[PDB]
Every structure is written in structure tokens, then in C-alpha cells.
Amino acid sequence: RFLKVKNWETEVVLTDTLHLKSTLETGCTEYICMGSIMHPSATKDQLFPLAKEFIDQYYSSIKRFGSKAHMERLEEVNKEIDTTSTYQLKDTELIYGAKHAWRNASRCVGRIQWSKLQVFDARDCTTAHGMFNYICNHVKYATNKGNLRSAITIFPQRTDGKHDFRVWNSQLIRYAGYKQPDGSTLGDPANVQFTEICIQQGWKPPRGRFDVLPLLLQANGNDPELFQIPPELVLEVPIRHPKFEWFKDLGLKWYGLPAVSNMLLEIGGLEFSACPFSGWYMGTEIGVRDYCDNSRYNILEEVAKKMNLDMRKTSSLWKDQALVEINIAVLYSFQSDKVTIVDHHSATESFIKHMENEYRCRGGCPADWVWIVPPMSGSITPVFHQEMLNYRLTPSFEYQPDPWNTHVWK
Amino acid sequence: CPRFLKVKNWETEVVLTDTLHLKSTLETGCTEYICMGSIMHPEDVATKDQLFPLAKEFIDQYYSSIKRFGSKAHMERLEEVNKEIDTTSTYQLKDTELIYGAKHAWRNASRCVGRIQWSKLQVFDARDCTTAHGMFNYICNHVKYATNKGNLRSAITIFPQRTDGKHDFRVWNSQLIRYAGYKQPDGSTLGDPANVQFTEICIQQGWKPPRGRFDVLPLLLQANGNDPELFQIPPELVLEVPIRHPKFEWFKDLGLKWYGLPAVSNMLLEIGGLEFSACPFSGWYMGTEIGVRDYCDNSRYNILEEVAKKMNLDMRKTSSLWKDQALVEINIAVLYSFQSDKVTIVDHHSATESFIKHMENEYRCRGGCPADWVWIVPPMSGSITPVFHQEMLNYRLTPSFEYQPDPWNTHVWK
Numbered sequence: 001r002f003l004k005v006k007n008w009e010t011e012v013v014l015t016d017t018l019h020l021k022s023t024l025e026t027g028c029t030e031y032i033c034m035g036s037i038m039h040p041s042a043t044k045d046q047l048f049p050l051a052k053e054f055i056d057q058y059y060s061s062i063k064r065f066g067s068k069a070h071m072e073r074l075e076e077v078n079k080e081i082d083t084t085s086t087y088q089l090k091d092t093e094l095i096y097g098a099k100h101a102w103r104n105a106s107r108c109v110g111r112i113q114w115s116k117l118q119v120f121d122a123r124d125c126t127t128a129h130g131m132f133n134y135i136c137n138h139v140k141y142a143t144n145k146g147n148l149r150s151a152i153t154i155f156p157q158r159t160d161g162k163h164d165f166r167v168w169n170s171q172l173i174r175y176a177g178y179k180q181p182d183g184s185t186l187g188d189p190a191n192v193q194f195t196e197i198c199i200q201q202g203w204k205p206p207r208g209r210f211d212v213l214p215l216l217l218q219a220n221g222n223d224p225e226l227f228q229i230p231p232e233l234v235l236e237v238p239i240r241h242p243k244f245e246w247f248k249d250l251g252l253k254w255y256g257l258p259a260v261s262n263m264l265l266e267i268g269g270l271e272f273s274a275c276p277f278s279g280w281y282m283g284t285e286i287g288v289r290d291y292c293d294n295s296r297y298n299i300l301e302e303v304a305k306k307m308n309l310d311m312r313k314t315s316s317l318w319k320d321q322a323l324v325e326i327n328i329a330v331l332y333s334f335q336s337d338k339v340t341i342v343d344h345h346s347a348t349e350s351f352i353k354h355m356e357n358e359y360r361c362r363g364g365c366p367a368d369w370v371w372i373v374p375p376m377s378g379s380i381t382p383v384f385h386q387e388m389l390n391y392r393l394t395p396s397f398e399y400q401p402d403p404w405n406t407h408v409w410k
Numbered sequence: 411c412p413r414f415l416k417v418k419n420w421e422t423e424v425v426l427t428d429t430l431h432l433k434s435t436l437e438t439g440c441t442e443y444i445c446m447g448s449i450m451h452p453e454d455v456a457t458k459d460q461l462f463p464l465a466k467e468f469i470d471q472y473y474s475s476i477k478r479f480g481s482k483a484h485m486e487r488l489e490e491v492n493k494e495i496d497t498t499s500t501y502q503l504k505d506t507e508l509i510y511g512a513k514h515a516w517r518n519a520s521r522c523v524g525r526i527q528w529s530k531l532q533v534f535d536a537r538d539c540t541t542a543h544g545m546f547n548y549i550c551n552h553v554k555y556a557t558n559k560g561n562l563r564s565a566i567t568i569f570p571q572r573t574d575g576k577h578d579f580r581v582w583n584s585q586l587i588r589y590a591g592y593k594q595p596d597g598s599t600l601g602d603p604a605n606v607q608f609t610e611i612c613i614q615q616g617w618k619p620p621r622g623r624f625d626v627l628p629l630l631l632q633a634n635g636n637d638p639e640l641f642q643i644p645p646e647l648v649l650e651v652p653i654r655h656p657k658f659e660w661f662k663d664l665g666l667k668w669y670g671l672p673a674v675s676n677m678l679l680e681i682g683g684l685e686f687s688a689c690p691f692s693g694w695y696m697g698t699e700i701g702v703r704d705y706c707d708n709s710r711y712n713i714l715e716e717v718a719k720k721m722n723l724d725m726r727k728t729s730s731l732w733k734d735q736a737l738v739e740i741n742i743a744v745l746y747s748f749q750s751d752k753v754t755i756v757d758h759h760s761a762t763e764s765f766i767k768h769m770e771n772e773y774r775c776r777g778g779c780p781a782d783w784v785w786i787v788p789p790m791s792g793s794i795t796p797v798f799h800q801e802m803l804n805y806r807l808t809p810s811f812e813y814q815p816d817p818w819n820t821h822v823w824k
């Protein structure tokens with residue numbers, strides 16, 4: 001049945017019909033909502049209807065549903081699943097599938113850009129060296145000297161589960177984290193375990209606060225191999241503040257390119273376990289979560305100190321004030337270095353415009369309020385006031401197990 | 411449905427196990443295929459047959475809570491209730507049950523961050539009320555008790571339950587204390603834009619409006635399904651706080667103030683299948699309710715622009731974050747003003763920390779704690795509060811507070 005969503009600030013009401021096309025589970029039931037749970041919980045027989053569904057919607061998108069080309073594609077695919085227990089996507093299908101996995105990503109506030117995605121087909125890759133070459137090309141292309149461009153690189157699909165392609169890095173570019181003797185942590189605390197795996201694998205750590213991690217790449221189920229991304233390919237931004245002259249002295253920097261490399265791309269029942277994708281940052285991703293999460297860089301105290309704020313009571317809101325200044329700094333630094341970045345006001349504004357576009361042309365837009373609303377100043381952004389329906393459309397990006405839990409070494 | 415559900419805190423890695431969800435009752439609005447977790451709201455009167463098991467379930471729960479389950483007094487209460495539903499199509503709660511039920515409706519309110527306080531609720535039994543004048547008396551006493559000269563105390567006043575649906579008690583006000591809002595001929599709004607409709611109802615009903623920026627609305631009170639009647643709350647019972655800033659001397663020049671007592675009066679209390687359509691309850695504010703929503707929502711008092719001007723902020727680019735900057739200062743002022751006037755208020759850091767402690771205790775002692783993340787996380791600085799990182803399960807337990815239709819939409823005028 002048709003569902004309505006209201007914006008409580010503008011009184012705009014949209015009608016969702018698109019949800020009628022979803023299949024696999026949200027995690028919720030009529031009795032229990034799991035909207036804030038981060039991760040809720042093939043064969044020839046399972047494969048064809050999934051392939052059929054996908055081919056059907058592809059040919060429906062290019063206005064040739066039921067065509068001879070459509071009819072023959074279905075036959076070709078069925079015949080191929082028959083003999084090889086799988087099938088291969090056409091290039092046009094791969095590109096359509098990747099764009100729509102982004103289009104369907106309910107947790108992404110950046111989806112107004114969804115159809116401008118550069119798709120790199122790396123399905124001919126066979127070795128970690130080949131993966132490294134492809135990933136370098138991606139990074140170089142996507143960075144584009146600061147004028148960032150959205151991109152995805154797609155490695156060979158899963159076959160028997162024993163020969164998976166995986167990027168072991170959760171993101172292509174991240175800073176190392178080190179467990180110090182005294183008990184504290186140097187670098188990025190989120191990456192302490194992964195940093196230790198790289199060290200355990202032969203990586204010589206500079207033990208700095210912003211050491212770019214090496215790539216750990218697994219091809220065709222083999223042991224992963226270490227690679228250093230060439231430093232000229234890694235664009236970084238020193239963080240400074242437009243008024244606080246002392247801010248530069250904090251010694252902070254971040255990288256310009258956000259590139260998720262641990263997710264799984266599902267298209268027509270096919271599983272692409274290595275599909276690193278990248279866009280550009282929303283300022284709060286760095287300024288709020290990376291720098292101010294207690295379990296991350298945790299710099300609020302220091303900043304509030306230099307701001308000489310009253311830090312004895314919570315109700316002075318010293319944390320909130322230091323937080324805003326940090327996020328001003330990040331946006332100012334990127335903009336000053338002409339590195340693409342978006343603030344949470346502009347991004348959420350664009351997302352409301354996108355939703356309206358999608359309801360008009362597509363009959364809806366799956367969206368996860370819990371992730372869409374920014375981690376600071378929530379209700380002064382327009383998505384706070386926007387009701388959203390969340391549901392799962394395919395093609396899609398999914399979570400998968402960390403490779404160091406599933407991999408049986410040499 | 412699975413016996414155990416786990417929730418993780420992603421900052422602390424603490425994992426909690428929920429069994430309480432097995433007792434969930436009505437719908438969330440969600441399905442296997444769609445989640446409605448961000449949807450704000452996702453005559454008929456229970457029949458004899460619908461009422462029996464709802465009453466039994468509640469009575470069983472009550473007698474379990476007092477460690478007398480299966481006792482003689484328990485079986486006798488069951489029998490008395492059953493006969494009463496049989497002979498009168500309804501039944502009456504004992505005072506003990508009424509108090510237990512109200513406290514648990516609060517305990518079960520998944521959208522409430524203040525529930526660590528739930529067992530400390532003063533319950534006022536107004537089921538002997540017959541007239542709007544009497545409702546007025548009960549509500550004034552509630553307000554005065556709850557206000558306690560600034561040392562606020564949580565309270566609920568419970569008016570007679572629904573009978574046939576044609577004799578409902580209702581407070582027409584959505585909250586006991588709100589400021590009027592006036593639409594002007596040029597399209598601008600004076601006062602609180604949120605209350606323009608209700609304000610015009612009051613004016614039609616005979617209220618003489620002072621037409622100012624902070625006019626306390628009168629009470630519009632309906633007893634026994636009769637037409638509602640207007641009453642002015644004695645102004646000495648309405649504690650207010652002028653808003654000033656500990657640093658910006660000019661902040662007081664904005665002429666802002668707010669009332670001390672948040673008191674919701676449009677919700678329905680369900681206990682044992684009985685429906686209490688008039689049950690105003692009150693607590694104390696979290697600062698952001700005022701500083702972020704009331705003052706800074708664009709469709710509310712919307713003062714961000716004027717605060718930013720007096721702060722001399724660059725307001726031409728959003729990326730200067732001038733809005734965020736002014737928002738923080740406004741919320742510093744609100745907390746500073748309440749604390750200085752010794753009126754109870756809690757900041758969002760303290761409230762959410764207490765809520766996590768509460769939720770952990772509930773998981774351990776009760777087997778769970780329904781919580782609505784979308785409502786629990788504060789409207790500013792979300793991720794620097796501990797609830798942001800906390801996975802939650804949302805489900806409906808009874809006794810409960812529920813939404814109900816606005817009374818002007820359903821009332822049959824006499």
C-alpha cells in the first residue's frame with residue numbers, strides 16, 4: 001500500500017510506492033524495530049530468479065523491457081548459470097548495477113550524485129599486484145588534484161567462496177594506530193588491530209600520529225600482500241583555523257579521499273567482495289567522528305584548553321563549543337586547499353532535493369534517518385525534520401565478515 | 411521471534427541482551443520489508459471480550475511486581491475484575507494499581523530520555539472529577555506541586571477513564587503551559603508559531619488575547635464529554651526564566667524567556683485496557699528542548715539569525731557554520747539562566763549519560779529497555795553524547811502513553 005512521508009518543518013508530504021519492490025529483510029518486525037542496529041542478521045537455483053529480476057529492471061530502465069535483446073539476454077544467462085553455476089555481467093549491466101547500488105544506499109546522504117559515478121571494471125584481475133595497480137589508478141583518478149571525482153573499482157566476483165578477492169583495509173586510505181607501552185594509543189585507535197596485522201605481516205611502522213597504512217590485498221583466495229601507495233597519490237590537508245592562530249600548532253592533518261573498501265556489492269545475485277568506492281568528505285565525518293569520538297583521536301579536551309573554556313561542568317557546553325570550532329577548521333582547510341568537501345548544511349539540503357527528485361521520478365527513496373542525520377547540529381539541518389522510509393533495494397552494498405576472521409592462511 | 415536479542419554500544423563495545431521484547435504488544439509500524447522508525451505517528455471502545463485478557467495481563471503483571479503472583483489476593487482480584495467487566499462492561503483500578511500503571515507507562519515510554527526517574531513519580535488521582543472547574547482545580551494543584559518554587563518534581567494527574575467514548579475528559583491544550591501564537595494579516599507570526607491553531611480556538615472560545623510574544627495560553631478543559639471551558643492559570647503559578655548569557659551582556663536585550671515546567675497534556679494513558687484520555691504529566695526540561703527546538707527551529711521562535719548578527723558572524727556561507735556556533739551559545743544561555751534562577755534543568759550530556767546507566771540497569775534487572783534512538787539522541791551534538799553510539803531496540807510495552815486525535819477534530823458540540 002502507498003505510504004506517506006511528511007516533513008514536519010515544511011509540511012511537504014511525499015507518497016512512496018517504490019517500497020513495494022523491496023525483498024530481503026530490514027531486520028524489523030511488526031513488534032520490534034531495529035532501526036538503530038548497525039548490522040542486523042549461492043546455487044544455480046537461487047541464482048537465476050535473482051539474475052532474472054536484475055536483467056528485467058535493467059532492460060526496463062533503458063526502455064526495452066520484453067525486447068528481443070531482453071529475451072535473448074535472459075536465455076543467455078539461464079544457459080550460463082546452467083553450465084558454469086554462475087554468469088558474467090555485460091559491461092553496461094555492471095555500470096548500471098554499480099550506480100544503482102549507490103542509488104539504493106539508504107545510509108548515504110550523498111546520493112544526489114549517484115548517476116555521476118566512474119566505474120572501473122577490474123574483473124580481469126588475477127593477482128594482488130594487479131589489484132594494487134587498479135587501486136592506484138582509482139586513487140589517482142578519484143583524487144584529480146583535489147577536484148575529487150566519485151569512482152568505483154570492481155574486482156572479480158565470488159565463485160566458490162574459497163577464492164575471494166578482498167581489500168583487507170576497511171578504507172583505502174587510513175592512518176595507523178599504535179598501542180603504547182604506557183597504555184595509551186598513538187595514531188588512530190580504530191585501526192590498532194589492522195595496524196598490528198600489517199606489522200605482523202612485515203610492515204615497518206614509522207610510529208607517527210598520521211602514518212598512511214599500506215594496502216593489504218588478497219586475490220583469488222591467496223594470502224594478502226602488502227603494498228605502499230605512492231605518496232604523491234595521497235592528497236592530505238593540514239588543518240588550520242581561520243581565526244584561531246594556535247590551531248595549526250595542534251599538528252592535525254587528514255586525507256582528502258574517503259574510500260570504502262570492505263563492503264560487498266551485490267548485483268543480480270552476483271557477489272563482488274572487493275569493490276572499493278570513493279567520493280568526497282562531508283566535514284563532520286572528519287571533524288566530529290574522526291577527531292572527537294572518545295574512541296578515536298579524542299582532541300576535544302585539547303581544543304577546549306586552547307580556547308580557555310570552562311571545563312569543570314558539562315552544562316558549560318565546552319564540548320559543543322570546541323566541536324563547532326574544529327569543524328569550522330576542517331571545512332576552512334579543505335576549501336583553502338581547493339580540495340572538494342561539503343558541509344552538513346549543504347549536504348543535507350542537497351539530500352532533501354534528491355529525495356524529492358526520487359519520489360517524483362522513481363516513486364520513492366529508501367533512507368536511514370539514523371545515518372542520514374549529521375552527528376552534530378541535527379535539528380538545524382532539514383533532514384532532521386524529514387520522515388524517511390527505510391527498505392532494501394537491490395543492487396546493493398552489504399556488509400561482509402572481516403577477512404582476518406574467515407581466511408585460512410597458506 | 412528469537413528468545414534473545416543483542417545490542418552493542420560501539421564506543422564502549424558493551425553488549426546487552428534483551429529478553430523483555432518477548433512481552434511486546436502492539437505494532438511499531440515496521441515490517442520485515444520496511445522500517446518506519448523515523449515516522450512520528452505510525453467511539454470504538456474495548457468490548458467485554460477484548461477487555462478481559464487485557465485486564466488479566468495487567469493484573470498478573472501487577473501481582474508479579476509485588477511478589478504475590480498466584481496468591482489468594484491475586485486470584486481474588488482477578489475474579490473481582492472479571493465479574494465487574496461482566497456486569498458493567500468495564501472495571502475500576504485500585505489506587506495501588508493506578509499508581510503502578512502510571513509509573514510503568516513512563517518506564518515503558520521508548521521516546522523518553524528521562525526515565526531513570528520513573529519510580530519517583532507523584533500520582534494524583536482525579537478520577538472523582540466531574541466538571542471542568544474541578545479539572546481546573548486539579549491542574550492548578552498539579553502545577554503548583556510540580557513546580558515547587560523551581561525545585562521541580564515529576565507528577566501526573568489522572569482524570570476519569572473513557573466509558574462510551576461520548577463522555578471523554580480531555581485537556582484541549584497539548585501542553586499545560588504554552589505561549590500563544592498569532593498570525594498577522596501580512597503573514598508574519600507573533601509569539602509561538604506552533605500554537606497558532608490552538609490560539610485561534612481559544613480566541614473563538616472567548617479568550618481576550620494580550621497579543622504579545624510570550625502570552626501564556628488559557629486552559630481549555632473538557633469534562634464528561636461536554637463542551638470545553640476556558641480558565642486562566644493564575645500567573646503566580648507559572649514560573650518563568652528570563653534568558654541571559656554568562657558572557658554576552660547583549661543576550662538579555664533579546665527579551666527572551668521560557669517557562670520552567672514541561673507538562674504534556676494531550677496523551678492517552680492505557681492501563682489494563684482502560685483508557686485515560688486526560689492524564690497531564692510533567693517533569694523538568696532538558697536544555698535542548700528549549701535552546702535548540704523552541705528557539706532555533708525555523709518554524710518556531712527562529713532566533714538563530716538575530717543571535718548570529720549580534721555575535722558578528724559571517725552569515726553568507728553555510729560552511730562558516732555560523733548557525734552551529736550561535737546554536738551552542740543559545741543553549742549555554744538557557745542552561746545558565748535556569749541554573750542561576752535555581753530552576754531544575756538538565757543538560758543533554760548529563761541526561762544521556764544518566765539514560766545509558768538507566769538502560770544498562772534495566773537490561774540487567776528487567777531484561778530490556780525499549781528506546782527510540784531517533785527521539786533519545788539530542789537535537790544538537792549527537793555523537794558526542796553516549797546514546798548516539800548505543801544500539802537500541804524499540805517495542806511497545808503496556809501500560810503505555812499513546813497519541814490520540816486532537817479533540818477539536820472529533821468533538822460533537824452541544
Ligand code: HEM
Pocket residue numbers: 098102105107108109110111113117150151152277278279280281282285342347371397
Ligand atoms: C560523492 C560524495 C559522497 C558523499 C558526500 C557521501 C556521504 C556519505 C556519508 C557522510 C556517509 C556516512 C558514512 C559514515 O558515517 O561512516 C555515507 C555512507 C555511505 N555511502 Fe556515501 N557519500 C558519497 C559518495 C558515495 C559513493 C560514490 C558511494 C558508492 C558508489 C557511496 C555509498 C555509500 C554507502 C554504501 C554508505 C553506507 C556505508 C555503511 O553502511 O557503512 N557514497 N555517505
Ligand code: HEM
Pocket residue numbers: 512515516519521522523524525527531564565566691692693694695696699756761785811
Ligand atoms: C523528569 C524529567 C524528564 C525528562 C528530563 C524528560 C525528558 C524527555 C525529553 C527530552 C523528551 C523528548 C520531548 C520532545 O522532544 O518533545 C521526552 C519525551 C517523552 N517523555 Fe519524558 N522527561 C521527563 C519526565 C517524564 C515524565 C514524568 C513522563 C510521564 C509520566 C514522561 C514521558 C514522556 C513521554 C511519553 C515522551 C514522548 C512524548 C511524545 O511522543 O511526544 N517524561 N522526555
Ligand SMILES: Cc1cc(N)nc(CCc2cc(F)cc(CC[C@@H]3CCCN3)c2)c1
Pocket residue numbers: 171173174258259260277278279280281282285
Ligand atoms: C564514499 C564515501 C564518501 C564519504 N563522504 N564517506 C564515506 C565513509 C568513509 C569512511 C572513511 C573512513 F576512514 C572510515 C570509515 C568507517 C566509519 C565506521 C565504519 C562503519 C561505521 N562507522 C568510513 C564513504
Ligand SMILES: Cc1cc(N)nc(CCc2cc(F)cc(CC[C@@H]3CCCN3)c2)c1
Pocket residue numbers: 524585587588672673674691692693694695696699
Ligand atoms: C514530561 C516531559 C519532560 C520533558 N523534559 N519534556 C517533555 C516534552 C515537553 C513538551 C513541551 C512543549 F512545549 C511541546 C512539546 C511537543 C512539541 C512537538 C509537537 C509535536 C511533536 N513534538 C513537548 C515532557
Ligand SMILES: C[C@H](O)[C@H](O)[C@H]1CNc2nc(N)[nH]c(=O)c2N1
Pocket residue numbers: 008384385386387388447448449450784785786
Ligand atoms: C522526522 C523525525 O522523526 C522528527 O523530526 C523527529 C526526530 N526526532 C525527534 N526527537 C525528539 N526528541 N523530538 C522530536 O520532536 C523529534 N522529531
Ligand SMILES: C[C@H](O)[C@H](O)[C@H]1CNc2nc(N)[nH]c(=O)c2N1
Pocket residue numbers: 036037038370371372420798799800801802
Ligand atoms: C548505534 C547507532 O546505530 C550507531 O552509533 C550509528 C548511529 N548513526 C550513525 N550515522 C552515521 N552516519 N555513521 C555512523 O557510524 C553512525 N553510527
Ligand SMILES: [Zn+2]
Pocket residue numbers: 028029032033034035440441444445446447
Ligand atoms: Zn523499524
